[PDB]
Structure formats: C-alpha cells, structure tokens
C-alpha cells in the first residue's frame, strides 16, 4: 500500500508540491500516463494541477504542484509506491 | 510595546527560586522559533545565558534553566545568588518582522539584606559660586537600604518646592543605595533666610541637615 | 579570544548622520551573520538590523527603515551601520553581535556581543562643566567638588591625580530640566589632615575636551 | 606557510605520485584564479526564488559559498586535489536555500550525463542538508549503485546526522567537521552533527579558499560543507590514481587510513559516543589487505519483540554480527539471509530499552560465505557449531535465545539454551585465529586487539556471565561491555 511522507522539521516543509514515486520497474510511458491521469481526475473535482517534471533514469515518477486535498486521490493511482511532500535543503 | 512580553521585575532572597516568563505569538514563539535568553549586569553588555529554549553555554551554572511551551517561554533560576541581580531579556525570531526581536526585559532584584539608614551630607553654596551669581545647596544621601527615599527642603521652617532636582536611587559598589538632591536659589534668597534644611525620609524615619549663610 | 569592538559613536544634531563600524577578530567572520542592537539609557534592548554572512539576507526594524543602512566587508572583518536623518529617539548605546549563518535553516542566539558605542542625538552642543569647591568645616570631615551644567555624559572625577581613592564617593549625575547634567564628588578625610594635606579634584569631561583641577581648602 | 587543513590531511609518509567531480551548490565564480578553466558551469539550475523582503541583489554575493567549496576541492593554490576537473550545478539560491525536488532533478541530470560522457570515475559533492527524506536517500542510493561516489555534509546542527538528508543515506559518505585541535567544530551554539550516519570527520573550521569578491581573493569559512569538500578532494585524488576503485573499496580505504582516536568524544552526547566514528580523514598513500568496518544499526525501540538490523554494502561480506544494550536486557543476535544477502539482526528482551545490531562488513574478494546454526543443546558442554567444509574458515559467532534464565579449531560455543550461529567463509588464502582476554574484576569493559597485520572480523563475549551488555568492534579492538568476563576476537588476514 502507498504511504505518504513529509519532513519531520515543520518549518522546512513545502506543502503544495509532491514527488510521486512509482513502483520499481515502472517505465517512462507509464509514469507519463499516471501523471496525466492524476491531472484528469483532479480536474474533474475542480482542481488545477501542474506536472513540473516526469522522472526517468534515477527513479520513476513525477513532480506535481497541487493541493494537499488531493493526496488521498493520488495515493490510489496505479503503480504508486509512495508520495513525498517537497521540503527545503540548506547550504551547510 | 515590545513584541515579546516579560514581567517588568521579579525578586527573591538568596537561595530562593524565581521564574521569568516570556510570552509571544504565532508569528514568533508559536511559529517554531526558539527563545534565547540574555543577562545584562549593570553597566555591561548583554551576555548569552540560555540558547535554544534550554541549552546552557559553557560557564553558565546549572541553577539557570529554560523551557518553552506553545507561545510562551520561561527562565528559571534556583539557588538565587547576589551576583544574579541583573536585567534578563528573552529573544526570538519573528517571521512577520524578519528580525530576532527582544522582550521588554525583566529587572531581577536580590532581597534580604539588612535595613540601613542613610548618611546625609549637606553643603551650602560656595563663595565662588555666589560670586558667579548662583547658589546651589547639595544634599548627598548614601549607604541606605532599601532603595527608596523622599527628600523635602525647608527654607527656615517652611517647605520649598521650586528649584529642587533629585536623582533616582542607584546601587553603590557596596550594594547599598545612593541619591542626591540639589536646591537652586538666587544669592539673595540664600542670604535672606536664616537656615535651609534637607530632610531625608527612609522607611518612616526622617534624617535632617541644616545650613546657614556665613 | 573571539572579539567584537564597535566604534564611531558621538554627539550629533537631529537630521545629522553617523557611521558606526564594528571590528571582528578571533573567529571566522565570513561564516557569521552580524547584527546591530541598541539600548536607550535605562531602557530595553532593541534589534536594529541584521546582515547575513554573504549579505543575501538584510533586514531592518521598522523604526529605522529608510534611514539606516547596514553593510559588511568580509575582507576587512568589519560590519557597518550608516545612520542618516538621526532623531533624538535614536540616542542609545549601539551593540554589534554575531550569530552563525545557518542560511535561514535555524535562527541561533546572538552568542558574542561587543561592548557598545554611545550615540547621542541632541539639538544641544557639548558644554564643559563649571566646577566649584565644596569646602569642609577630631574624627573625619567631608569635602568635595560640585560639577555643574555639562553635556553630554560622562565626566570622570579623580582626587590628587588618582593618589587618593579611599573615601571617595562620586555620585551619579542629575539631569536638569534644562537638559544639562550636574554631579558631586565627595571624599571623607581625617579632619586632622585638614590644612596640611592639600586636596585637589581632577574633573575630566572628554566630550568637550575640558579638564579642570580645583583645590578644595577649609573655610 | 601552507594551510593547517591541507597539512592535516597529508599523512607523515606522503609521496605525491580522468575523474569528474560534480558540485551541487550555489552559483560559482568560474573566472576565479583558483579554478579558472578547470571548473565548467553546466547549464543546470533549479532553485526557489529568494525571500524578497530580505534580498538586496545589489549587495548579495550569490557566488560566495559555491566558489569557496570549488576552491577547497580543486583550487590551484589552496585546494585538496589541485587543478582537478569540476562541473557545477546550481541547486541553492543566493540565500543558500534549495528544495529536495530541485536536488533530485540535479541528481537525475548527473545520471543522464554519466551515460553520455565516456565511462570513468565521478565524485558528487552535496554540501547541503535538509530533513530526513526517503526520496532523496533513495535517489542517492540508486546513483551509488551505478558507481558514483557521493560525498555530503553531516550537517551543522550539533544533532544526530540520521535525522538529515542526504547525511542519513547509508551509501553516501557523510563527513563531520573538526578543527585544528582535531575536536568537533562548534558553529554558533551548534556545530558538527554526529552519530552512526557520519562516516568520518575532516577539517571544517577556518578553511581558507577562493572568495568571489575578486578573482585573486581568499577567505576563511567554517562548516561541514568545507569538511565534505575535503573528502571529495581526497576521493578525487584516490580515483585519479586508481580509476577502477569501487565506492566500497574507496570507503574502506578512507576509514582505514584516517587518523584514529584524536577526537575527545566528551563533546558528543553520551549515548552517541559509541555510535560516532573517531576518525579524521587523511590522504591514503594508496595506489595499491583485508579491510573491515563496523556498521551500527538504528536502535530497535522499546517494543520487546522488536528487532534491530545492521546491513553491509552490496560489494561487502558480513563476517560477524553482535549486539549491545545499554542495560543488558537483550536476547542476542542472529545472522540471517534476506534477499540472498546476509544481515545482522538483534533481538530485544521483554522489558525496557531496545537493542543495537552491530555488523562487521569486510571486502573479501572471491569469497563464498554462509551461516551455520545449531539449536539449543541442554548439555553441560553447551551448544556447539563449526565449519565442517574444508577451506571454510570461521570468521564470527552469534548467539540468540528465548528467555532470560541463563545462569550456572573453527568452533562456536554458546549457552545451553541458546542457538549458536557461525559465519564460515571460503576465500583464497584466508586464515583466521582466535585471541582471548579475561579480566576477573570487569570495570565496565574488557578488550582484546588483533596484532598488526591482522584484521578483526569477529568480536564476542565468552558465555556464562550475567554481567554482559554486549560486544562490538572498534577498528581492530574487540570491546566487551559489562555492568569475570572474557573478550573473544577472531582475527583474519589474506596470505
Ligand atoms: O496507463 S493508464 O492511462 O493509467 O491506463 C491503464 C488503465 O488501467 S489502470 O490505471 O486501473 O491500471 C486502463 O483503463 C483506465 C480507464 O481509462 C480512463 O478513461 C479512466 O479515466 S481517466 O480520465 O484516464 O483518469 C477510467 O477511470 S475513471 O477516472 O474511474 O472513469 C478507466 O476506466 O487500462 C489499461 C490496461 O488495460 C492501463 O494501462 S497500464 O498497463 O496501467 O499503463
Ligand atoms: Na552516511
Ligand atoms: Na581552498
């Protein structure tokens, strides 16, 4: 089952942008289609979303700017391994 | 008028435990920013006392501790010592001001020392100042505890309200209080009366000194 | 020895300008943010301005916005505060203080402070003091000198050029309604020494470049 | 007249006789004389915009952090790998802030460009940290499995590095910072991170390097960014001389040739002192032994059928497995298979704290290892197991049991009521021997060390003592922790 992950340090959280990580062996064309399916499901519920990036090569999945309202919907997409909320990194 | 609110003053006797609160809001303490505390000894720069709500720098005794909860923070001092007499300031970043703002400060007073009656010294106008056409009477008040006096001036036997300026009592290096009072007169006023008196009242006892023209 | 030394304070008229500077030594200045905090006499600490290690974060208290400009020069291990359009309420001791630059990941304590430089903003020019003897009249006797109508603070008082310290009490100044200061210094001496030991108070008022020596004699 | 930090990583008997270093950081000043013509700015840029309420572009030095780090790695006069070739990617804005998502896209860019340029060693320097991120750690692991050496800052928060990413990614080399006195750096009221996710420390205070003020200017900076840049320089020089060093071999050599025990561990919180390696990085003479390292697991947690698990890198063999509990309420440890690879699992008692599993992970070429177990015996001689096959050598012994009522060559012996597990390995010229040391009055710990030339592979306490907290290897010293106790080391070497 698909889990949701966020930064433990609350002031470093960046809600509204999510990395959707798909199961290992997912092919680029399936990540691409899963992103478009999320967009279509969310549009039917009155939500604008933006696909910012479709990953291939390191991990399979995509980067999406969308309302946290849609996380439950996104967790039910086919192939989803887990979803992580964006967060900050800092010069050390 | 500060963004963080502290009590103006706290006090205790040596050995007691006192606390100092710091309350803020959702844009600073309640937003996840840590509270830091500073101690300012009289006539010194502030120094770091507690960092990150509860961490003690090297050289700060474990009598000092801090905590934070919600929109408030607290500094606690156990085993109060005389050298703890100082001003204490809390501090926190505020995201709506984009700066690390300070509480209004808390004056900590260490109590318990024995009562002490003031020494009073009264000087008449010098002849040099009279030659310069002025006249100042100088009432000096020292070595008293606790640190509140009232001063009244008498021309002969009647009160003088005009021309009086009195300092606020402040601690000497020997941990007792000192103050001074100045009576401005014209040379003719000084010469016309038979006496002037400085009356110093401390804990319901009055010490009086008197000077007369020569 | 981590150290911060601020400089450049002085007396200035309203609407005037001053440039403070702060010299750092003993630590890796280029990895620390820097801050100005001021304190009006007898008042609380007030944050003025902050600048990050690479100057990519700069902010100002509302009360100084548009009049003060903070900057730093990492090669010269220095921090600056350009103050324009000064007002009387800007009168204060100005401290500099460091905080390690976590790039906004964490806002740390100001863990090292300087000693402060004093800034007075006043429509009054500096005025040196008039000093008068407070003559004494077999135990101890009290004698002193009255240090009248100076501005701004401070004056220092010594007796017999520092050779007389025991029994000396220099009192805190009174601020007159005129805006000028006066204080008194008194020394308690053996009355048998009167008229054999001569007593001289040495008044130093650096803001006006005035030194006064006044011998205090009985009668 | 040379910087203290460059001297510090140069070992006593140093003899100065193809690699790409990628830097993910702020923008850099590529014109600077330290790096002019040896560092190329890629066109990669993915950064969040600055906080405009505090940003004065006219005054900001956007290049200050990256320029200094590029200089530390490869600067002509003050760098570690002088003149080394570098490629910079911008994932931090002028205010030193980036995103996990932008960092991922930068790591994907490195993966893409690896498949295009001719195959060769590459080092990726990540001088940044955010909170623990599962996706960022996973992207780092996948890049590591493609033969990339990733080096990262431990973090500047005087905290456990396992709460930060990419610090907490196990296959990333995580570097804490030490000062000229070899003590952990303090930064403001914080300082270098610590804990079991830090692989080693390196100079990170008062580090002179390129300043973007002007093309010939220099400046000192402090932080674990600077320390990570030192280890990225060291990696680049190692890979320049041995282009087919693998990451696993590189990590074992970094550990092996570091200065040991120069840090006063009182700086660390008490419960992190055993987890934090006491190592300060140094250039290995290298250019080419049996290398082993200790791997602590996370705490198991106060559930009392909870297990801790410690794992080795893919290229490594697990030669032994032990466990430790600060109050000794444990049920031992067990070596077990998981996806055809052998892991070290420790078991909790049934009341109180939690346990650590402690793996010993070794580079043993052409080895075939296996574990052999015997059920509890209920016999006065106890439970015995040994490596029956010829040429299979005993490298480590493990023991786990069921409930805490225990009180009365090439072989493992354990309590009567405990299962016993033997690690046996076949490898050309592998030879191992046992050393023991017993103390009648155990003052907290009894130790025994392998002689020079031998490598500690297994560390163990002799059974039958209720006063044993556990056992773990520290370099080549076996350490048994007590509340008469005997420490048992297995020491090996290759021909
Ligand atoms: O790769 S996909 O575009 O997701 O297509 C797969 C999908 O099956 S699956 O997602 O359950 O694995 C498909 O049929 C889905 C079908 O088509 C749409 O119209 C969809 O609506 S939407 O606007 O695309 O979101 C419908 O669902 S609905 O929104 O509840 O009305 C839906 O009924 O079948 C093929 C396999 O036959 C899938 O291909 S793949 O191997 O998963 O890549
Ligand atoms: Na690591
Ligand atoms: Na350098």
Numbering used by the authors:
A (entry chain A): 61 to 152
B (entry chain L): 1 to 214
C (entry chain H): 1 to 137, 143 to 224
D (entry chain B): 153 to 169, 179 to 449, 454 to 573, 585 to 659, 671 to 682
Task: Quote the original article.
PCSK9 interacts with LDL receptor, causing its degradation, and consequently reduces the clearance of LDL. PCSK9 binds LDLR on the surface of hepatocytes and triggers its degradation in lysosomes thereby counteracting the beneficial effects of statins at the posttranslational level. The hepatocyte surface is covered with heparan sulfate proteoglycans (HSPG) that are known to play important physiological roles in several aspects of lipoprotein metabolism including endocytosis of bound ligands. Our combined results lead us to propose a model in which HSPG on the hepatocyte surface capture PCSK9 and present it to the LDLR, hereby ensuring optimal conditions for PCSK9:LDLR complex formation.
We examined the electrostatic surface of PCSK9 and identified a putative heparin-binding site composed of six surface-exposed basic residues located in the PCSK9 prodomain. The binding site is formed by arginine (R) residues at position 93, 96, 97, 104, and 105 and histidine (H) at position 139, which docked with sulfate groups of a heparin pentasaccharide (SANORG). The site is found opposite to the LDLR binding surface located in the inactive catalytic domain of PCSK9. The sulfated oligosaccharides dextran sulfate and pentosan sulfate both bound directly to PCSK9 with affinity constants of 180 and 381 µM, respectively, as estimated using Microscale Thermophoresis (MST), and resulted in dose-dependent increase in cellular LDLR, reaching a plateau of around 400% compared to control. The interaction was dependent on the presence of sulfate groups as non-sulfated dextran showed no affinity for PCSK9. Thus, it appears that a number of negatively charged compounds display inhibitory activity toward PCSK9, and to further understand the structure–activity relationship crystallographic data on a PCSK9:heparin mimetic complex would be desirable. We noted that dextran sulfate was a constituent of the crystallization buffer for the crystal structure of PCSK9 in complex with a Fab fragment of evolocumab. In the PDB data set, we discovered electron density surrounding the α-helix constituting the HSPG-binding site, which was 11-fold above the background level, and had not been accounted for in the published structure. We solved the remaining part of the structure and found it to encompass a dextran sulfate disaccharide interacting with R93, R97, R104, and H139 of PCSK9. Taken together, these data suggest that the number and positioning of negatively charged functional groups of sulfated sugars and mimetics are critical determinants for their binding and activity toward PCSK9.
